[PDB]
Design a protein around this ligand. Structure first.
Ligand SMILES: Oc1c(Br)cc(/C=C/c2c(Cl)cccc2Cl)cc1Br
Ligand SMILES: Oc1c(Br)cc(/C=C/c2c(Cl)cccc2Cl)cc1Br
Lengths: 115, 114, 115, 114
């Protein structure tokens, strides 16, 4: 129900081995760790969570773009790219969070489908 | 030294009256308020800080996109748009952080010039 | 070897039933029709061409964004989105042309892989 | 009534000295040259046309992105970036066409204001 896809606009390729950390806002208003992983050779990260665990809430997907660019000899502008959204508040949905990265820019979108 | 510009991809216009909050990362790794404002009729926010105040450090610019779309009657995806970056004295002096907003997407870039 | 993917930034969904026309620059410098189709329920258009037919050249992928938005009651800004690129000039590659659409904006990227 | 602004997502700067050609769709459905220029040090191109000349019609703005990246020593994907749109008198009067360039991607938006 939660997938992350990352592309590299400089290379025209998937962004491989990009660390992703997901957090969920807790009752006390702090960000609790929720899931993490690294993107594959296709720039995809699957298997973060299950429909049982992915309850309603406010989630933050942090994509470690600085570590990515530094590993290729680019000193980038952003520390990371952060996507914050309410999920599942009208029931379960499937979310794809996609990001396109450049050293001084990024764009992100969400595709939200109803299984 | 720090300007923010916000544009609306649905209406093809500046994004007017958008709240923007800027934070600087503190010693204890929390985010301390630094500056804030609302974008003007041109979608710009100027006069956030001064050169003296804007020292090297990690800054977060939070744009209240959710309120913006709600005001237009449109249901958005994001709670806000975040832009987190290090200000470094070596690089050029003036930072423009621009954001292009759609309900389920945003794009941001930095223009860093002398 | 040539795939097109289209997303809608307003809805947070694939852009379905979007017409796509591909042209190849001919010897006389005119644009020759090459392939066409419509995106699926997943916002994807596969099966445009074959590795045999997709020779070196300059290609134009025209995405009929105006027809798309008009069909949803938006009067959009652009007539279409056009992506023009040299393909296969160092041998065969696989190309994904992706576009993210808003009424007054679009973004496009290419993912280019070597089979 | 028509301005173009081009930014570079790799360097975080305006895209300077970029050739821009503008065409208007003619009676016979071909593209006739209308205006052209090179972006300034701020990545902007002003003074393309006048209100009198810029009548309703279909216009194409072609940005020579390939030459821009080649000049920087970078191998790009696109031959150019194209933006094709109708100018309509009902809508606001001033059109800004902005483009954010990367080697394998570009984004464009229209800011249409009065
Ligand atoms: O397989 C996919 C999936 Br799913 C999503 C995207 C989205 C790309 C995109 C973004 Cl994320 C931001 C701005 C512009 C763009 Cl064209 C691309 C591919 Br290729
Ligand atoms: O006056 C300006 C300045 Br300064 C900067 C930008 C950048 C716009 C943009 C962004 Cl922010 C993300 C993705 C694509 C785009 Cl065309 C636009 C205008 Br109009």
């Amino acid at each position: 129900p939660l997938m992350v896809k990352v592309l590299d606009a400089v290379r025209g390729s998937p962004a491989i081995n990009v660390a992703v950390h997901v957090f969920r806002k807790a009752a006390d208003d702090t960000w609790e760790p929720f899931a993490s992983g690294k993107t594959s050779e296709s720039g995809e990260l699957h298997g973060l969570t299950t429909e049982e665990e992915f309850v309603e809430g406010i989630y933050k997907v942090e994509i470690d773009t600085k570590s990515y660019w530094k590993a290729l000899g680019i000193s980038p502008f952003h520390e990371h790219a952060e996507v914050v959204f309410t999920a599942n508040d009208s029931g379960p949905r499937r979310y794809t969070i996609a990001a396109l990265l450049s050293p001084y820019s990024y764009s992100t979108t969400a595709v939200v489908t109803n299984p």
